[PDB]
Amino acid sequence: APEVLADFHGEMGGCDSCHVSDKGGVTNDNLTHENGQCVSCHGDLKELAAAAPKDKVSPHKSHLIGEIACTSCHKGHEKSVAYCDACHSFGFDMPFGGKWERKFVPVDADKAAQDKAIAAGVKETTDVVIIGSGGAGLAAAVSARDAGAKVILLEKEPIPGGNTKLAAGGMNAAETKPQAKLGIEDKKQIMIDDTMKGGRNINDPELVKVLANNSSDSIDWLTSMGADMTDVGRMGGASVNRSHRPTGGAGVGAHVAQVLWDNAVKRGTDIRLNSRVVRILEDASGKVTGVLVKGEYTGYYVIKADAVVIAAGGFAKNNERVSKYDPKLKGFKATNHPGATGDGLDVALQAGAATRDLEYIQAHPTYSPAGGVMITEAVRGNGAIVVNREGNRFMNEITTRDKASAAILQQKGESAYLVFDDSIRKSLKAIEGYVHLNIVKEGKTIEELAKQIDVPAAELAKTVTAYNGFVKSGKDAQFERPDLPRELVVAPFYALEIAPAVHHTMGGLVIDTKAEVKSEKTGKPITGLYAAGEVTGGVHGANRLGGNAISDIVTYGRIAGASAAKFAKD
Ligand SMILES: Cc1cc2nc3c(=O)[nH]c(=O)nc-3n(C[C@H](O)[C@@H](O)[C@@H](O)COP(=O)(O)OP(=O)(O)OC[C@H]3O[C@@H](n4cnc5c(N)ncnc54)[C@H](O)[C@@H]3O)c2cc1C
Ligand code: HEC
Ligand code: HEC
Ligand code: HEC
Ligand code: HEC
């Protein structure tokens, strides 16, 4: 029994097969050579993908964006797990396979060993350091690179794009070209007012102004980098159709993550995967001088830089931490990728950074317990209805998420069903992937759908003809639903069991419109420390509206990148 990958290969050629040297060892955390050797012998992703069965789901052709290494799944000296295992359950036949498991390691554990190495010299310099490879960081790698900084960006997972790459529903922006093309009359103020009402007026009004005001330049920016943001639909809590997404209702996440990845990489961004930043370095009256990296394979190393951008994401995946704030959520499932655990929040805190709103944890109301994935709010915005086990509607389906989850939780079985038709289906191309994931019930009639779910045919049917009249009259007499887009009358009929999940953390680092990280001692910025995206707080108040986090990450990430780079010129 030879079982792990490198031992299997051991039997054939040794150590230089994968390693540069015949003694073994990696030379860089990206594992450049080892993957290259894999590709020399087995072909690369296109070629692997090229040969799979023309039916369903292959592990070499997925929706992960950016450069996805072989070794990020085919492990050499330990069991291998497909990365997909972190979110789906396709039960693949992984040669040399183990099961998925991730232990949370405190950024602070191994304090002695990091100190020897901060002492053990400063190994390398650069202008701007950017932490994390989601939109905030990539948006910022571009913008800093455009300004002349030399940038180094670190990502702790084996693959890039963090939660951003999974987004679907859209990016909000007011007063855009796409809206002009569709004749949607919207106003930057309205977007402001929508953001403030929905975050229960505790949002920092200065950050919501910039987020609203810069939104349309920030659609334009993406377009000029190659993005396609021409599809606009509704999301809950907004009064105007403002969620931007690729032609036809395709999710934005993979699309935006990959245009931004391309552009960071086409400027000379030095991106390092499997590299986790475990500390930001210190000095006099606390000026940021660089950071301490912990490479998975090459260990601890200090990189000196003038400015440091924190684009590290939220902590909703770490239920422990989520639960200390809102014990309600102990044990709920999350919609996040695995690395959304809190890491850069600690890092920043260990650096004196100020924090705000950390106890306001959003729960997304329509998570698919069978699929193990989130169903976009855009299904509801596009016209779906939500219905309980008696076949009756219990809420306004484009309401704020704190409220939508609460209602679903007070129904029998803590869960309800998304009910939409064939027009809703063809108006939102993301629906097509829940369909490819085998989790959508299809009945040829409303009553045939009811059998499939297990709901009273008479009552579902009753609630669907009831809801169509509200759609013709323009007034939902049951719940208060302000947008009633589509009659829900073209057969075949679809249904999906949804239930709430932990999703996004509104709190975080305190910043100002320049992406500057403010101090807990003074209220004044820490010189040279900047940040953007969900690791920061203030933008969303106590309930993020759907659409504002991709808007936040682009707009703010662009600001931190430009801002940190000017710092570097001085
Ligand atoms: C499934 C899903 C769908 C959503 N869809 C939408 C949508 O349609 N519209 C919308 O507005 N919002 C949506 N959101 C919310 C939106 O995705 C933002 O929450 C997310 O994009 C945040 O971007 P970010 O840059 O802040 O971080 P992320 O995308 O999390 O990027 C994170 C990088 O930091 C790396 N990292 C963290 N700590 C360290 C460390 N110490 N060292 C090194 N690297 C580190 C992490 O691994 C991570 O990859 C959705 C969220 C989810 C999960
Ligand atoms: C390994 C490379 C993966 C394979 C194969 C697939 N995935 Fe994913 N996945 C995830 C989510 C949250 C969704 C819904 C997409 C969204 O709405 O953002 C999906 C979707 C799929 C689909 C159907 C959709 C499509 O056809 O594009 C397939 C066939 C699929 N996934 C296979 C979540 C995750 C995830 C968590 C962070 C990971 C690592 C992967 N998926 C990876 C794989
Ligand atoms: C290709 C199949 C390999 C062969 C043959 C050998 N190694 Fe390797 N090694 C490979 C990978 C993909 C990786 C990255 C981590 C992983 O286990 O997937 C590695 C890593 C190492 C390391 C670093 C381990 C760590 O610091 O965690 C060492 C010291 C190492 N490999 C040594 C080594 C020796 C001595 C080998 C010959 C007997 C050898 N490797 C063969 C892939 C492959
Ligand atoms: C050339 C020197 C190789 C390098 C470098 C790597 N692999 Fe390889 N691999 C090679 C051969 C000749 C074989 C045997 C083919 C056969 O006759 O079956 C393999 C086998 C594999 C397998 C199959 C495991 C199984 O189905 O049990 C896998 C998944 C595999 N190799 C992957 C892989 C990866 C990810 C590599 C980079 C680290 C890699 N191999 C290096 C030839 C060579
Ligand atoms: C995780 C998302 C993967 C990445 C990235 C790569 N591979 Fe893969 N590989 C993975 C799985 C789950 C499987 C098994 C499929 C099954 O269920 O049997 C495989 C299989 C292989 C094989 C076997 C045979 C073949 O299809 O030719 C080989 C040779 C292989 N993988 C190599 C390989 C290389 C070179 C990759 C880099 C481009 C690579 N894989 C990526 C999971 C994943």
Q: Which of 102, 129, 153 is the last residue of a domain?
A: 102
Take atom 39 of ligand 5 and give the residue whose Cα is closest.
70
CA 59 – ligand 5 centroid, Å: 7
Q: Are residues 78 and 151 in the same domain?
A: no
The amino acid at 549: A
Most ligand 3 atoms within 8 A of CB, residue of 8, 11, 12, 19 to mutate: 19
Can you tell me which atom of ligand 5 is nearest the CA of 51?
A: 26
145, 276, 279, 401: which one is catalytic?
401
Q: Are residues 252 and 351 in the same domain?
A: yes
Q: What is the dihedral of CA 203, 205, 211, 215, to 10 degrees?
A: 130
Q: Are residues 215 and 188 in the same domain?
A: yes
For the Cβ of 386 lying below 6 angstroms from any atom of ligand 3, the answer is no
Give the other-Cβ count within 10 Å of 445's Cβ.
Answer: 13
* Residue 122 and residue 115 in contact, taking contact as beta carbons nearer than 8 Å: no
Tell whether residue 18 is among the known ligand binding residues: yes
DSSP 348-412: HHHTTB-EE-TT-EEEEEEEETTTTEEPPTHHHHTT-EEE-TTS---S-TTS-HHHHHHHHHTST
Q: Are residues 267 and 382 in the same domain?
A: no
For the Cβ of 86 lying below 6 angstroms from any atom of ligand 5, the answer is no
Whole-angstrom Cα distance, residue 529 to residue 512? 12
DSSP 323-348: HHH-GGGTT--B-S-TT-SSHHHHHH
Take atom 42 of ligand 3 and give the residue whose Cα is closest.
76
Q: What is the CATH number of the domain that holds 66?
A: 1.10.1130.10
Q: Which of 505, 526, 550 is the last residue of a domain?
A: 505
Most ligand 5 atoms within 8 A of CB, residue of 73, 93, 157, 165 to mutate: 73
For the Cβ of 309 lying below 6 angstroms from any atom of ligand 1, the answer is no
Ligand 4 site residues, Cβ closer than 6 angstroms: 9, 13, 17-18, 34, 37-38, 41-42, 70-71, 74, 76, 95
Whole-angstrom Cα distance, residue 311 to residue 140? 8
Q: Is residue 570 exposed (0-12), middle (13-18) or buried (19+ Cβ within 10 Å)?
A: exposed
Say which experimental method was used.
X-ray
Quick check: is 401 catalytic? yes
| Ligand closest to CA 49 | 5
Kind and range of the H or E run holding 291: strand 290-295
For the Cβ of 78 lying below 6 angstroms from any atom of ligand 3, the answer is yes
Take atom 36 of ligand 5 and give the residue whose Cα is closest.
70
Q: What is the CATH number of the domain that holds 298?
A: 3.50.50.60
Backbone interruptions in the chain following residues (C to N > 2.5 Å):
none
Which of helix, strand or coil describes residue 209? helix
Q: Are residues 541 and 419 in the same domain?
A: no
For the Cβ of 76 lying below 6 angstroms from any atom of ligand 3, the answer is yes
Q: Are residues 187 and 287 in the same domain?
A: yes
**What one-character DSSP code corresponds to residue 429?**
T
Take atom 5 of ligand 5 and give the residue whose Cα is closest.
70
Q: Report how far apart, in Å, the C-alpha atoms of 238 and of each of 190, 340, 357, 381, 416 are.
A: 9, 27, 22, 10, 23
* Residue 280 and residue 288 in contact, taking contact as beta carbons nearer than 8 Å: yes
- C-alpha closest to that of 84 among 442, 94, 47: 94
Which residues does 394 contact at the CB level (< 8 Å), separation at least 6?
A: 386, 387, 388, 407, 408, 411, 416, 479
For the Cβ of 26 lying below 6 angstroms from any atom of ligand 3, the answer is yes
Can you tell me which atom of ligand 5 is nearest the CA of 38?
A: 35
Which residues, in sequence order, are bridge partners of residue 293? 277, 301
Take atom 14 of ligand 2 and give the residue whose Cα is closest.
373
Give the other-Cβ count within 10 Å of 7's Cβ.
Answer: 13
Most ligand 5 atoms within 8 A of CB, residue of 41, 42, 46, 71 to mutate: 42
Tell whether residue 343 is among the known ligand binding residues: yes
- The two three-digit tokens of residue 462, written as one number: 């009753």
The amino acid at 235: M
Most ligand 3 atoms within 8 A of CB, residue of 16, 73, 77 to mutate: 77
* Residue 311 and residue 137 in contact, taking contact as beta carbons nearer than 8 Å: yes
CA 159 – ligand 5 centroid, Å: 15
What residue spans of 428-456 are helical by DSSP H?
A: 431-436, 446-453
Whole-angstrom Cα distance, residue 451 to residue 445? 10
Which residues, in sequence order, are bridge partners of residue 374? 367
CA 268 – ligand 5 centroid, Å: 29
Which residues does 416 contact at the CB level (< 8 Å), separation at least 6?
A: 386, 387, 388, 389, 394, 408, 497, 498, 499
Q: Are residues 76 and 117 in the same domain?
A: no
* Residue 529 and residue 288 in contact, taking contact as beta carbons nearer than 8 Å: yes
Strand pairing category for 493-505 and 307-310: unpaired
- C-alpha closest to that of 449 among 432, 461, 462: 461
Query: How many domains would you assign to the chain?
Result: 3
Q: Report how far apart, in Å, the C-alpha atoms of 499 and of each of 366, 369, 467 are.
A: 5, 7, 22
Q: Are residues 456 and 491 in the same domain?
A: yes
Whole-angstrom Cα distance, residue 91 to residue 108? 35
Q: What is the CATH number of the domain that holds 424?
A: 3.90.700.10
Q: Are residues 155 and 237 in the same domain?
A: yes
Range of the domain at 253: 103-360+508-566
Q: Are residues 337 and 370 in the same domain?
A: no
* Residue 517 and residue 510 in contact, taking contact as beta carbons nearer than 8 Å: yes
Q: Are residues 328 and 415 in the same domain?
A: no
Q: Which of 58, 81, 102 is the last residue of a domain?
A: 102
* Residue 400 and residue 407 in contact, taking contact as beta carbons nearer than 8 Å: no
Q: What is the largest CA-CA distance in the chain?
A: 76
Q: Are residues 255 and 159 in the same domain?
A: yes
Tell whether residue 60 is among the known ligand binding residues: yes
DSSP 85-133: GGT-------TTB---------TTTTHHHHHHHHHS---EE-SEEEE-S
